[PDB]
């Protein structure tokens, strides 16, 4: 139905947890106060890309590394 761009204005910690990686990488937790929650990311979001980096079939660690690059634009899909 839709793909969405969720952009986080980083200060640093994002305030989210991910599961999955090499059947896709998914947001498993969003700290209520954290930057991710404030920016509109939601549990169940599947991360497709990070700042243009395709992470659809990324490793778990690869996804972590992409998220910790030095705004953080996340392309996500919800199933």
């Amino acid at each position: 139905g839709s793909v969405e761009e969720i952009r986080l204005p980083r200060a640093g910690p994002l305030g989210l947890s991910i599961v999955g990686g090499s059947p896709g990488v998914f947001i498993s937790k969003v700290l209520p106060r954290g930057l991710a929650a404030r920016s509109g990311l939601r549990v169940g979001d599947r991360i497709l890309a990070v700042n243009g980096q395709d992470v659809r079939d990324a490793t778990h660690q690869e996804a972590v590394s992409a998220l910790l690059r030095p705004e953080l634009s996340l392309l996500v899909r919800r199933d």
Partner: peptide, 7 residues
Amino acid sequence: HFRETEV
């Protein structure tokens, strides 16, 4: 069971 990483 499913590794979860805080970021």
